[PDB]
Amino acid sequence: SGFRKMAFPSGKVEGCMVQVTCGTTTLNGLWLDDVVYCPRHVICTSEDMLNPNYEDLLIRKSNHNFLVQAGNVQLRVIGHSMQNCVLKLKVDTANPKTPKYKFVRIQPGQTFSVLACYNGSPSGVYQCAMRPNFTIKGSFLNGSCGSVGFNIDYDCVSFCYMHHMELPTGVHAGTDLEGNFYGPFVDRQTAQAAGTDTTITVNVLAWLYAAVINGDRWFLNRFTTTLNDFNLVAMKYNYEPLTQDHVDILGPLSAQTGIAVLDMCASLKELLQNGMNGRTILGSALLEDEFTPFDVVRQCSGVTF
Amino acid sequence: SGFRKMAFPSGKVEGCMVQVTCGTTTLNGLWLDDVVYCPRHVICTSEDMLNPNYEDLLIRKSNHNFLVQAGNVQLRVIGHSMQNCVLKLKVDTANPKTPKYKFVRIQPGQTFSVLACYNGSPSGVYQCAMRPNFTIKGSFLNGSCGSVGFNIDYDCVSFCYMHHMELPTGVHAGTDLEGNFYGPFVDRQTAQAAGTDTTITVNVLAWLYAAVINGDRWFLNRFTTTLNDFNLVAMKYNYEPLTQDHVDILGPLSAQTGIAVLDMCASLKELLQNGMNGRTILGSALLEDEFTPFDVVRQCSGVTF
Ligand SMILES: O=C1N[C@]2(CCc3cc(Cl)ccc32)C(=O)N1Cc1ccon1
Ligand SMILES: O=C1N[C@]2(CCc3cc(Cl)ccc32)C(=O)N1Cc1ccon1
């Protein structure tokens, strides 16, 4: 029993991380097959980042200006192209550690693991969620650009995130592996504002189910509610609206615990209105929203990879 | 910026996990060089676990009764011995993925990463602390026995924990890699009570320093205190006593922030006495104690492996 903020094992991704240097900028790249993916702002200087014209900056770059180092061995760059906000560096050697993989663009509220890297070397792994305003609350320092987020299904790595930048508010923004930013952000050092950070309601409910499965039941209440009545409470508390698709996805947790989804919504509602009175749930003093329903069933049943 | 419950990259340990079967019991083992380490209760049946005589049970076992499977390939067992509460299985093949490693017995309050495994396959990785009562608050289901805890320093894996059992309270107990339990627990299905779970004071202070570094400063107060005055408050709140060794270890964080350790203790004291008034610190609504001072400096400076 017990419940933990658990990340995927990172070994399959560790074997794909490399260091990419261009001029005086060094960041991380992802080496899959014979292509290395990295943020296109690797071609920029700090003076460049206020209003970069990436197409113009890329004219002054040739294949040999991109230094790619995998471990302590040097990769030969045989072609380069810009796809949206990522650079693709064609190297002459396929990565021998390439796992089965897919590139996926995730939806807000979905979770993934981040392997934080500096100079192409892994520093740590942690679990994140794509916030409803399309930021992530990560842990990144200078040089972390190009670190990636991923999910694993048995043997297939789904890459969903590449880190590009920190907003002035200390939250983080990045792209999918096709180079398209999540949310409205652009890769330039301009003040950019994130949007309201709302709570991922379907995830909170999944975590409440996880609490019940693990024996933490004090918050279970005598009430039920309706989807419209709950959502009217949800908007007051900056919670995302709950839809019937969300109810459907919670079905297996409802079945395991015998607690109807709408009954759990009524328990959540009383927690939003009354607070937690200094009590805790699964060791947290607030309502946790970075476990998906699939995360909960995975962790509570022991799916392996 | 930002601050996350971050685990070490697990790839080096993933390559050492194997499945060990004896009779009808299957659990995880750790394959390093030509030895496989697993919990000795692999030789037990469920009827055995009320009062097992391991020396007697081991008489009825031969090398060929231990089935060791690494990936989907079978290892040949050429010798076995019991060391405290772990079995050591000598195999004829050295693990080619063996990293540099050490076996370390950690102190309460120290943290480590856990790679949770089932049937020798990794399921997830998370960060834990050895509680002052010598339990860990993990996430483990049946079949997780033999999962290991570890720390990494550049290229050396320090293994500190092997999972053996869940207490009736849902917390977890296990051994170092020499087979000696942390705390007073024994590998039998008897009711065993854990001891008071106190808060790791030096870790809370480190995390308060991490909050300051990351801009979360509302709790900084106008007061200072003394080590004896603080500890008198500490014992009322079931916090571990703070010693001058702890003050010494916080020195670098004190130097980075300009906040004397005793000033931070005075801020902590007011937080214990007044609570947090519905405010949060680094996204937590309670005081976090599973970051060590070394964890904080590591994460806030980007040490890699
Ligand atoms: O290394 C850098 N350089 C930064 C500074 C501001 C900036 C603006 C742009 Cl457009 C692109 C990259 C950067 C940045 O955000 N990081 C990564 C980082 C630091 C903290 O969290 N993530
Ligand atoms: O797979 C098993 N079998 C258990 C059941 C009770 C027990 C008693 C002893 Cl002496 C040794 C092993 C076991 C156990 O604790 N686990 C691992 C587990 C389950 C949940 O968290 N960890």
XYZ file of C-alpha atoms and ligand atoms in Angstrom:
654
model
C 0.000 0.000 0.000
C 1.076 3.660 0.137
C 0.990 6.294 -2.571
C 3.906 8.210 -4.062
C 4.617 10.802 -6.735
C 6.240 8.175 -8.947
C 8.148 8.747 -12.178
C 8.822 6.250 -14.918
C 12.197 4.505 -14.896
C 14.448 6.782 -16.910
C 17.095 4.412 -18.289
C 15.598 4.277 -21.777
C 15.738 8.068 -22.036
C 19.122 8.448 -20.299
C 20.679 6.611 -23.238
C 19.373 9.261 -25.655
C 20.626 12.438 -24.011
C 23.510 14.326 -25.614
C 25.174 17.716 -25.330
C 24.704 20.222 -28.153
C 26.930 23.288 -28.476
C 26.640 26.072 -31.022
C 29.011 28.995 -30.697
C 29.000 29.759 -26.974
C 25.617 28.201 -26.067
C 25.460 24.654 -24.667
C 22.239 22.722 -24.004
C 20.787 19.203 -24.159
C 19.631 17.276 -27.180
C 17.696 14.056 -27.732
C 19.458 11.504 -29.985
C 17.004 9.071 -31.618
C 18.012 7.002 -34.636
C 20.329 9.346 -36.589
C 18.635 12.639 -35.615
C 19.353 14.909 -32.648
C 16.520 17.181 -31.496
C 17.246 20.340 -29.509
C 15.694 23.790 -28.887
C 16.383 26.097 -31.796
C 17.496 28.842 -29.456
C 20.838 26.993 -29.255
C 21.859 29.262 -32.185
C 21.210 32.434 -30.196
C 23.373 34.669 -28.059
C 21.903 36.431 -25.014
C 21.783 39.683 -26.973
C 19.820 37.701 -29.585
C 17.051 36.554 -27.250
C 15.141 39.842 -26.984
C 13.860 39.634 -30.587
C 15.519 36.734 -32.440
C 15.010 36.208 -36.178
C 15.773 32.507 -36.231
C 15.616 32.149 -40.012
C 18.280 34.874 -40.339
C 20.471 33.480 -37.542
C 20.367 30.023 -39.149
C 21.792 31.385 -42.447
C 25.112 32.000 -40.665
C 25.304 28.385 -39.411
C 26.704 25.312 -41.157
C 26.677 21.638 -40.172
C 30.117 21.934 -38.553
C 29.003 24.759 -36.260
C 26.857 22.243 -34.326
C 28.955 20.271 -31.851
C 27.147 17.132 -30.634
C 28.763 15.075 -27.879
C 27.296 11.752 -26.710
C 28.997 10.758 -23.512
C 32.601 11.663 -24.210
C 32.429 10.838 -27.941
C 31.790 13.267 -30.786
C 28.985 12.881 -33.346
C 29.389 13.992 -36.971
C 26.613 16.353 -38.096
C 25.636 15.757 -41.731
C 22.595 17.998 -42.048
C 20.375 20.356 -40.096
C 16.889 21.765 -40.399
C 14.502 23.849 -38.321
C 11.053 22.402 -37.559
C 8.945 24.970 -35.743
C 10.935 25.764 -32.584
C 13.256 22.740 -32.619
C 16.422 22.061 -34.552
C 16.909 18.602 -36.074
C 20.566 17.660 -36.489
C 21.206 14.758 -38.815
C 24.213 12.773 -37.604
C 26.078 10.007 -39.369
C 25.555 7.421 -36.583
C 22.261 5.945 -35.401
C 21.988 5.903 -31.615
C 22.544 2.241 -30.619
C 20.506 2.842 -27.459
C 17.448 4.103 -29.366
C 14.311 2.641 -27.726
C 10.994 2.120 -29.416
C 9.456 5.581 -29.280
C 6.654 7.866 -30.438
C 6.206 11.657 -30.384
C 2.928 12.646 -28.742
C 1.324 16.018 -28.121
C -0.425 15.766 -24.761
C -3.517 17.492 -23.400
C -3.574 19.772 -20.340
C -4.042 17.714 -17.205
C -1.956 14.817 -18.486
C 1.162 13.847 -16.557
C 4.654 12.792 -17.607
C 8.136 12.224 -16.207
C 10.946 14.768 -16.731
C 14.607 13.760 -16.898
C 16.396 16.985 -15.962
C 19.788 17.240 -17.685
C 22.773 19.611 -17.814
C 25.571 19.385 -20.402
C 23.903 16.250 -21.780
C 24.141 14.438 -18.409
C 21.143 13.301 -16.303
C 20.658 15.048 -12.980
C 17.329 13.678 -11.740
C 13.867 12.487 -12.636
C 10.485 13.726 -11.416
C 6.793 13.619 -12.291
C 5.008 16.671 -13.797
C 1.634 17.606 -15.217
C 0.819 19.873 -18.130
C -1.099 22.658 -16.379
C -4.428 23.884 -17.812
C -2.629 27.133 -18.746
C -0.004 25.047 -20.667
C 2.932 25.586 -18.308
C 4.634 22.996 -16.187
C 5.810 23.480 -12.620
C 9.255 21.968 -13.049
C 12.674 22.145 -11.438
C 15.067 23.623 -14.008
C 18.208 25.790 -13.811
C 20.235 27.481 -16.556
C 21.489 24.884 -19.017
C 18.449 22.626 -18.569
C 17.076 23.539 -22.029
C 16.388 20.437 -24.129
C 15.539 18.198 -21.165
C 12.576 16.055 -22.130
C 9.301 14.792 -20.701
C 8.048 11.324 -21.509
C 5.686 8.455 -20.696
C 6.459 4.743 -21.070
C 4.087 1.922 -22.089
C 5.849 -1.439 -21.649
C 8.767 -0.845 -24.016
C 7.651 2.243 -25.996
C 8.738 5.733 -24.900
C 6.240 8.473 -25.800
C 8.098 11.779 -25.804
C 5.729 14.676 -25.170
C 7.803 17.638 -23.928
C 11.055 19.445 -24.555
C 12.011 22.199 -22.130
C 12.707 25.632 -23.645
C 12.329 28.399 -21.092
C 11.374 29.756 -17.686
C 8.778 32.521 -17.510
C 9.424 35.490 -15.156
C 6.996 33.849 -12.704
C 9.270 30.819 -12.323
C 7.081 28.354 -14.206
C 8.280 26.541 -17.291
C 7.308 26.371 -20.947
C 8.320 24.172 -23.816
C 7.347 22.316 -26.935
C 6.343 18.940 -28.173
C 9.000 17.082 -30.170
C 7.695 18.603 -33.408
C 8.724 21.983 -32.016
C 5.249 23.450 -31.371
C 4.961 25.236 -28.050
C 2.402 24.156 -25.554
C 0.233 27.218 -25.047
C 0.773 30.707 -26.451
C 4.458 31.056 -25.614
C 7.257 31.974 -28.030
C 11.007 31.439 -27.661
C 12.051 34.995 -26.951
C 12.983 36.852 -23.764
C 9.844 38.943 -23.617
C 7.535 39.151 -20.647
C 4.865 36.527 -21.319
C 1.979 35.887 -18.940
C 0.744 32.356 -18.377
C -3.020 32.444 -17.697
C -5.056 31.260 -14.713
C -3.602 28.091 -13.192
C -6.706 26.077 -12.481
C -6.901 22.746 -10.674
C -7.250 19.538 -12.717
C -10.531 18.260 -11.246
C -10.533 14.746 -12.732
C -7.040 14.195 -11.289
C -8.064 15.341 -7.799
C -10.928 12.810 -7.898
C -8.602 10.052 -9.035
C -6.301 10.850 -6.104
C -9.278 10.808 -3.714
C -10.042 7.310 -5.043
C -6.399 6.394 -4.433
C -6.783 7.650 -0.861
C -9.830 5.442 -0.314
C -8.040 2.383 -1.755
C -5.162 3.027 0.646
C -7.407 3.423 3.699
C -7.633 7.197 4.091
C -11.409 7.620 4.316
C -12.194 10.445 6.774
C -13.298 12.799 3.994
C -16.021 10.444 2.702
C -19.275 12.218 3.307
C -22.971 11.379 3.361
C -23.907 13.440 0.308
C -24.152 13.196 -3.430
C -24.432 15.869 -6.132
C -25.014 16.499 -9.817
C -22.512 17.345 -12.493
C -24.017 20.832 -12.980
C -24.208 21.468 -9.230
C -20.622 20.324 -8.730
C -19.284 22.431 -11.596
C -20.976 25.525 -10.232
C -18.865 24.935 -7.121
C -15.883 24.011 -9.313
C -15.741 27.403 -11.072
C -15.864 29.318 -7.804
C -12.686 27.500 -6.749
C -10.868 27.743 -10.123
C -11.292 24.020 -10.706
C -11.667 22.777 -14.276
C -15.235 21.769 -15.192
C -15.975 18.075 -14.958
C -17.510 16.437 -18.032
C -19.100 13.081 -18.697
C -15.890 11.960 -20.416
C -14.134 12.534 -17.080
C -16.829 10.558 -15.223
C -16.341 7.762 -17.755
C -12.591 7.656 -17.215
C -13.063 7.380 -13.438
C -15.371 4.349 -13.892
C -12.813 1.658 -13.003
C -11.887 3.453 -9.767
C -15.569 3.865 -8.969
C -16.015 0.132 -9.571
C -13.049 -0.875 -7.379
C -14.153 1.226 -4.406
C -17.920 1.057 -4.737
C -18.083 4.878 -4.533
C -20.088 6.476 -7.334
C -18.248 9.272 -9.138
C -20.926 11.781 -8.196
C -20.652 10.759 -4.526
C -16.929 11.439 -4.690
C -17.671 14.796 -6.308
C -19.873 15.593 -3.304
C -17.023 14.725 -0.971
C -14.667 16.955 -2.984
C -17.215 19.795 -2.864
C -17.380 19.677 0.928
C -13.573 19.704 1.025
C -13.512 22.827 -1.164
C -16.107 24.569 1.029
C -14.864 23.493 4.475
C -11.158 23.012 3.847
C -9.297 20.154 5.495
C -9.284 21.368 9.133
C -5.589 20.605 9.556
C -6.103 16.995 8.501
C -4.101 15.307 5.749
C -4.912 12.984 2.851
C -2.209 10.553 1.722
C 0.286 12.708 3.589
C -0.744 15.924 1.800
C -2.342 18.936 3.451
C -3.841 20.104 0.137
C -5.714 18.468 -2.742
C -3.214 16.885 -5.177
C -3.947 17.159 -8.904
C -0.938 15.647 -10.699
C -2.128 12.019 -10.691
C -4.288 10.980 -13.654
C -6.887 8.203 -13.356
C -4.512 6.008 -15.363
C -1.643 6.877 -12.992
C -3.754 5.773 -10.037
C -4.745 2.428 -11.557
C -1.138 1.898 -12.721
C 0.378 2.547 -9.305
C -2.324 0.692 -7.388
C -1.972 -2.428 -9.598
C 1.782 -2.535 -10.280
C 2.087 -2.217 -14.065
C 5.692 -2.724 -15.185
C 7.843 -1.724 -18.159
C 14.007 27.792 -10.430
C 11.315 25.586 -8.861
C 11.675 22.705 -6.442
C 10.650 19.087 -6.947
C 10.759 15.757 -5.140
C 13.461 14.492 -7.491
C 14.839 10.963 -7.725
C 18.142 9.881 -9.181
C 18.135 8.595 -12.757
C 17.476 4.886 -12.422
C 19.095 3.416 -15.544
C 22.169 2.132 -13.720
C 19.977 0.187 -11.297
C 17.420 -0.937 -13.907
C 20.182 -2.986 -15.523
C 20.707 -4.934 -12.282
C 17.168 -6.053 -11.515
C 16.252 -9.713 -11.988
C 13.434 -12.064 -11.055
C 14.078 -14.726 -8.414
C 11.720 -17.673 -7.953
C 11.935 -20.391 -5.328
C 9.151 -22.942 -5.218
C 5.997 -20.858 -5.601
C 7.370 -17.490 -4.387
C 8.593 -14.903 -6.912
C 10.321 -11.627 -6.000
C 13.058 -9.265 -7.201
C 16.791 -9.656 -6.898
C 19.783 -7.388 -7.461
C 22.425 -8.799 -9.854
C 25.876 -7.264 -9.274
C 29.011 -8.923 -10.627
C 28.245 -12.663 -10.311
C 26.049 -12.456 -7.181
C 22.284 -11.983 -6.932
C 20.947 -10.503 -3.685
C 17.339 -11.067 -2.631
C 15.255 -11.245 0.583
C 15.717 -14.588 2.278
C 11.986 -14.977 2.699
C 11.925 -16.080 -0.963
C 12.320 -19.623 0.473
C 9.136 -19.346 2.529
C 5.534 -20.287 1.909
C 2.715 -18.189 3.390
C 2.164 -20.837 6.056
C 5.890 -20.442 6.808
C 5.785 -16.708 7.505
C 4.172 -16.825 10.956
C 7.306 -18.284 12.605
C 9.905 -19.216 9.965
C 13.088 -21.097 10.882
C 15.164 -19.951 7.940
C 18.164 -22.151 8.722
C 15.880 -25.219 8.647
C 14.028 -24.130 5.493
C 17.350 -23.569 3.705
C 18.442 -27.196 4.348
C 15.728 -28.357 1.925
C 16.989 -26.049 -0.861
C 19.699 -26.675 -3.452
C 21.259 -24.380 -6.054
C 18.822 -25.579 -8.731
C 15.778 -24.663 -6.638
C 16.610 -20.962 -7.184
C 15.375 -19.768 -10.570
C 17.000 -16.465 -11.594
C 15.767 -14.753 -14.753
C 17.433 -11.608 -16.132
C 15.199 -10.135 -18.768
C 14.007 -13.211 -20.615
C 17.264 -15.161 -20.138
C 18.024 -17.699 -17.421
C 20.994 -17.463 -15.036
C 22.800 -20.562 -13.741
C 23.035 -20.636 -9.935
C 26.334 -22.130 -8.751
C 26.143 -21.463 -5.024
C 23.984 -19.878 -2.355
C 24.435 -18.558 1.149
C 22.406 -16.666 3.731
C 23.835 -13.403 5.098
C 21.609 -12.069 7.856
C 18.211 -11.597 6.182
C 19.366 -11.701 2.550
C 20.180 -14.603 0.284
C 23.254 -14.350 -1.951
C 22.979 -16.452 -5.104
C 26.244 -17.062 -6.897
C 25.642 -17.243 -10.646
C 28.030 -18.304 -13.369
C 27.777 -15.019 -15.335
C 28.872 -11.565 -14.198
C 26.252 -8.918 -14.931
C 27.612 -6.982 -17.949
C 25.604 -3.941 -16.840
C 27.170 -3.859 -13.359
C 27.877 -0.211 -12.435
C 30.465 0.966 -9.977
C 28.721 0.459 -6.650
C 29.035 0.413 -2.867
C 26.803 -0.966 -0.093
C 26.044 1.679 2.524
C 24.026 1.566 5.725
C 22.308 4.938 6.022
C 21.238 6.957 9.051
C 17.644 7.964 9.844
C 16.796 11.206 8.098
C 18.846 10.380 5.015
C 17.065 10.146 1.674
C 17.371 7.784 -1.282
C 15.610 6.803 -4.498
C 13.535 3.598 -4.748
C 13.120 1.684 -8.007
C 9.894 -0.248 -7.426
C 9.910 -3.569 -9.299
C 7.600 -6.548 -9.882
C 8.724 -9.851 -11.432
C 12.176 -8.322 -11.935
C 10.783 -5.470 -14.089
C 10.909 -1.750 -13.165
C 7.588 -0.071 -12.473
C 8.587 3.395 -11.254
C 11.061 5.476 -9.316
C 10.485 7.800 -6.360
C 12.348 9.552 -3.556
C 12.120 8.312 0.075
C 13.635 9.050 3.456
C 14.599 6.648 6.212
C 12.226 7.726 8.988
C 13.556 8.298 12.529
C 11.662 5.135 13.565
C 13.505 3.201 10.772
C 10.543 2.685 8.440
C 10.069 4.169 5.023
C 6.824 5.547 3.638
C 6.977 3.822 0.272
C 4.626 2.684 -2.466
C 4.815 -1.118 -2.620
C 2.347 -3.891 -3.527
C 2.647 -7.676 -3.237
C 5.627 -8.890 -5.243
C 7.654 -5.720 -4.622
C 10.022 -7.529 -2.213
C 13.666 -7.087 -3.231
C 13.173 -3.640 -4.779
C 16.125 -1.487 -3.803
C 16.905 2.021 -2.600
C 20.020 3.814 -3.755
C 21.945 7.075 -4.107
C 24.257 8.012 -6.989
C 27.479 10.067 -6.865
C 28.674 10.767 -10.426
C 29.096 7.167 -11.582
C 28.976 5.192 -8.298
C 25.693 3.679 -7.077
C 25.444 3.410 -3.280
C 22.825 0.790 -2.472
C 21.331 1.368 0.969
C 17.955 -0.422 1.100
C 16.269 -3.637 0.076
C 12.521 -3.878 0.597
C 11.280 -6.822 2.686
C 7.853 -6.164 4.148
C 4.860 -3.968 4.907
C 3.850 -3.488 8.536
C 0.118 -3.681 9.436
C 0.125 0.139 9.539
C 0.998 0.337 5.838
C 4.567 1.561 6.265
C 7.532 -0.374 4.957
C 10.582 -2.074 6.420
C 13.688 -3.581 4.946
C 17.390 -4.181 5.186
C 20.679 -2.862 4.012
C 22.426 -4.966 1.363
C 24.239 -6.945 4.066
C 20.828 -8.181 5.187
C 20.556 -6.276 8.494
C 17.150 -4.737 9.071
C 16.821 -1.059 9.622
C 15.255 -0.759 13.056
C 13.950 -3.559 15.267
C 11.966 -5.439 12.634
C 12.262 -9.142 11.786
C 11.140 -10.973 8.643
C 8.109 -12.740 10.031
C 4.370 -12.072 9.804
C 3.968 -10.975 13.393
C 2.425 -7.716 14.488
C 5.368 -5.339 14.871
C 4.956 -1.731 15.971
C 7.114 0.968 14.434
C 7.758 3.690 17.046
C 6.976 7.409 17.036
C 7.370 8.915 13.564
C 9.077 12.187 14.328
C 9.885 14.966 11.873
C 13.446 15.284 10.528
C 14.207 18.829 11.716
C 17.444 19.432 9.789
C 15.639 18.464 6.565
C 12.737 20.852 7.217
C 15.271 23.679 7.664
C 17.056 22.738 4.464
C 13.722 22.869 2.623
C 12.962 26.273 4.175
C 16.317 27.440 2.770
C 15.290 26.001 -0.600
C 12.060 27.998 -0.358
C 13.987 31.215 0.277
C 16.346 30.539 -2.660
C 13.306 30.040 -4.891
C 11.568 33.229 -3.741
C 9.032 31.940 -1.219
C 9.802 34.224 1.728
C 6.536 35.044 3.544
C 7.442 32.869 6.532
C 10.684 34.756 7.276
C 10.183 36.362 10.634
C 11.827 39.047 12.743
C 13.057 36.721 15.486
C 15.984 34.552 16.395
C 16.376 31.777 18.978
C 18.833 29.461 20.686
C 19.454 25.805 20.068
C 18.133 24.861 23.536
C 15.095 27.131 23.193
C 14.306 25.758 19.742
C 14.655 22.132 20.828
C 12.299 22.680 23.735
C 9.750 23.664 21.085
C 10.960 20.816 18.855
C 10.096 18.074 21.375
C 6.597 19.419 21.929
C 5.951 18.958 18.203
C 7.663 15.538 17.853
C 10.510 17.081 15.879
C 13.971 15.546 16.193
C 16.380 17.597 18.332
C 18.719 19.853 16.411
C 22.432 19.531 17.188
C 25.480 21.574 16.314
C 26.398 18.980 13.678
C 23.082 19.811 11.988
C 23.809 23.557 12.207
C 27.204 22.859 10.642
C 25.696 20.948 7.737
C 23.288 23.815 6.998
C 26.211 26.292 6.803
C 26.419 26.495 2.997
C 22.685 27.226 2.723
C 23.018 29.828 5.458
C 25.892 31.377 3.498
C 23.993 31.423 0.180
C 20.902 33.097 1.634
C 22.434 35.278 4.323
C 19.985 33.807 6.874
C 21.656 32.509 10.027
C 20.657 28.958 10.945
C 19.277 30.100 14.284
C 17.171 32.771 12.547
C 15.695 30.069 10.341
C 15.030 27.978 13.442
C 13.066 30.930 14.834
C 11.016 31.078 11.657
C 10.352 27.326 11.884
C 9.321 27.706 15.540
C 6.708 30.324 14.678
C 5.420 28.030 11.924
C 5.058 25.178 14.431
C 3.221 27.424 16.914
C 1.004 29.378 14.495
C 0.583 26.902 11.658
C 0.566 28.101 8.065
C -2.812 29.915 7.977
C -3.815 28.255 4.713
C -0.667 29.495 2.990
C 1.726 27.227 1.104
C 5.505 26.879 0.871
C 6.963 25.565 -2.390
C 3.501 24.281 -3.236
C 3.137 22.320 0.023
C 0.595 23.033 2.740
C 2.741 21.282 5.371
C 6.418 21.295 6.347
C 8.362 18.879 4.094
C 11.115 16.787 5.690
C 12.392 14.442 2.963
C 14.995 16.798 1.463
C 18.457 16.666 3.054
C 20.772 19.698 3.055
C 22.822 17.910 0.393
C 19.670 17.296 -1.679
C 18.883 21.008 -1.577
C 22.353 22.123 -2.672
C 22.381 19.382 -5.343
C 19.036 20.378 -6.830
C 19.648 24.115 -6.542
C 23.053 23.853 -8.295
C 22.426 21.146 -10.912
C 24.867 18.358 -10.024
C 24.849 15.636 -12.688
C 25.701 11.933 -12.882
O 19.169 28.215 -19.551
C 18.210 28.953 -19.690
N 18.197 30.139 -20.317
C 16.901 30.812 -20.211
C 16.964 32.174 -19.485
C 15.757 32.949 -20.015
C 15.497 32.320 -21.351
C 14.704 32.803 -22.382
C 14.593 32.034 -23.530
Cl 13.606 32.614 -24.844
C 15.231 30.819 -23.669
C 16.020 30.344 -22.627
C 16.165 31.114 -21.489
C 16.073 29.725 -19.469
O 14.881 29.782 -19.220
N 16.910 28.663 -19.246
C 16.452 27.354 -18.777
C 15.918 27.502 -17.389
C 16.421 28.258 -16.320
C 15.577 28.085 -15.283
O 14.588 27.267 -15.683
N 14.816 26.899 -17.038
O 4.693 -9.293 -1.277
C 4.642 -9.122 -0.071
N 4.369 -10.050 0.858
C 4.288 -9.483 2.205
C 2.905 -9.658 2.871
C 3.191 -9.604 4.373
C 4.625 -10.031 4.471
C 5.322 -10.428 5.602
C 6.660 -10.763 5.456
Cl 7.562 -11.267 6.859
C 7.307 -10.704 4.240
C 6.598 -10.301 3.113
C 5.257 -9.995 3.237
C 4.682 -8.006 1.920
O 4.844 -7.136 2.758
N 4.911 -7.904 0.572
C 5.523 -6.733 -0.060
C 4.599 -5.569 0.091
C 3.203 -5.521 -0.035
C 2.827 -4.251 0.215
O 3.932 -3.537 0.492
N 5.065 -4.394 0.411
